[PDB]
Write a protein that binds this ligand. Sequence first.
Ligand SMILES: [Mg+2]
Ligand SMILES: [Mg+2]
Length: 227
Amino acid sequence: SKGEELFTGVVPILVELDGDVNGHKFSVSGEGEGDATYGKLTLKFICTTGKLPVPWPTLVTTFVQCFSRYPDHMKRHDFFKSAMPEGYVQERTISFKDDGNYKTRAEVKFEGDTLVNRIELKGIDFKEDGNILGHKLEYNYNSHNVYITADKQKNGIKANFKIRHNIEDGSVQLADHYQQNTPIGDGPVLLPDNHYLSTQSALSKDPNEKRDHMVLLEFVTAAGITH
Ligand SMILES: [Mg+2]
Ligand SMILES: [Mg+2]
């Protein structure tokens, strides 16, 4: 199909987010590249407004699942690439257990040859000395499965998953994710059978970077269907 062919090589990525969490307003810019042939993403994010008022890991899922590797036998289930180049809206509610929530609305599409993720994020109901506003989360990331189901009435998909953020005391802060994707354009899109994205992420720091930032290396493979 047309949109999957846009991803057979290395594709430059731009991410731009504006956020307001409990009235703390901030912006982040990111750049990198994806190689969906290998399910591979490399991204660097910079807080352009100063210090990020929430922990970097809490934003990883919000900051391009079109770069997932869909095995050849699963290509007919790849909604994300099928919506390209016109793109898709991706919306989430992220519910931090015993704390606040983020609501995100993003548009993922090509601008020229560059894959862009533009996000508005709103966070409310956070506790002033909870794990988020209190910055009690370790700078690391666990592996998780993203469970995808079709949403035919919206010509799109939904997903549900649980992200676990490690707390500095050794405990875990659960972030329940509910997700909806809808295509922006008028091209045909693929409505998938149930499957999941097996996702692993590593966070690091650029030793030469003094702005508040995050480097992300992520690998994602679609799975759960055998033939
Ligand atoms: Mg291929
Ligand atoms: Mg731990």
